[PDB]
Every structure is written in C-alpha cells, then in structure tokens.
Amino acid sequence: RSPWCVICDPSVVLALKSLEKDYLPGHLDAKHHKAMMERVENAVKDFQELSLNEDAYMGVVDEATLQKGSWSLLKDLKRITDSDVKGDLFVKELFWMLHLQKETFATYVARFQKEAYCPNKCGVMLQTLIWCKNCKKEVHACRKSYDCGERNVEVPQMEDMILDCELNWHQASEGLTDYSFYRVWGNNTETLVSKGKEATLTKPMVGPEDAGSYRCELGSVNSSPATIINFHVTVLPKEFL
C-alpha cells in the first residue's frame, strides 16, 4: 500500500487543491464535495498497478519520470476543468481520467525500472531517486562488481593508442569527478600519467615503451571510484607474425 508518486509533485497537489476550492463550487452540488475529495484522496493514496508484476514495484522514480507523469495528469485534469463539465458527467469523467492516468503512470514507472534504474553493469553509479512513500529525494548508490573486464589493446608500432574508460552510464551518473590514468609498472610502482575530465587517454605514434598495464579510475565525490578499468597494451612490432 503505497502512494501514487504524482503527489510528490507540488504542481499536482496545487491543481488538486484548486479542483476542490475553485472547481467544485460551480460544477458539483455542495452535498457531494466532501465525498468527492475523499474519493480523490483515496485514488492518490494507493497505487497498486505494478504490485503484481514479475519485477516488484520498488516505490521509486527519477525526476524525469515524475515530471512526465505529473505533466500527463495535469494536462488531463485541465482538459476536464477547461471543458466546464458538471454534475454526474463530471464525476464519471474525473474518475475515468484518474484510472487512465494511473495506468499511464504505471507504464512510465515500469519503463524507468526496466531501463533507467541502476543501468550500470559494473562499478558504482550514483542516481537521484524520489521515494514515493515519503516524497524524499536522495542519491542512491547503484553498487555492482568492481570488475569491468580487462581490455586487450593491441596497437601496431607507430600507430595511435586510444585507451577508452568511458561506460554508457557515465554521462548519466551523479557525483563524478575525474578520470585518472595510471601506468602500472612491473616493479610494484605506478605513475599517474593523466587526470582530467576526458574519458580517453591518447598517445600518438606508439613505441615499445608504451606497452604494459594501465589502470583508469573514475573518481566520485564518495570514497570509492565510480569505475575501474584495466587495459593491457601490447605494441606490435612490424616483425611479428
């Protein structure tokens, strides 16, 4: 038993309060006002549309999903109020619209869950979620295996080395800082060779001295890195078979 997340949008609560104080007086008999608003409140206080799905309803959305559901509800409600509909027909249309809007919102949430909730496959992604139970907006840590799979990079001698540390979800993550690239030497020391906002390390015209191990770390405002990727560079001399 969980609220319909649209109530966490202030414009929705305002439009609902406006329905009650401004619309009801000229459009529904006074003796029904209390019972209507109770029925509206009950519709908004429970959202069951996703609670028998294979993927359990988690009670969270992102701001994008919230805004899309809210805008869809506000537009449909405004169509009712702009129409100036009254009485029995107004009641029928209002509750029909709320059912439809819950089903529309369910579609948006199932899609958020399937595609946009913690979409990383490794590393730690930070994403702001709104928790529908209390309308709290917080940064959630999407913690996955720190192993992103080692990259085997073979570069012909004299060609350009590109080491790419970017993952598909990095552009969407919160709290990121810099990509640092380290060369990891066989004598158990390391050298920081680049640090900045760029997700790649480029070395033009590679020679043997550029072969070996590299580690990329994408920093976070938190303690742990958002991503660690290891690269092994083999520099292929022309003489190889």
Ligand SMILES: *[C@@H]1O[C@H](CO)[C@@H](O)[C@H](O)[C@H]1NC(C)=O
């Ligand atoms: C460790 O190896 C690196 C790369 O070969 C080199 O720059 C460094 O001087 C070595 N350190 C020692 C103490 O031998």
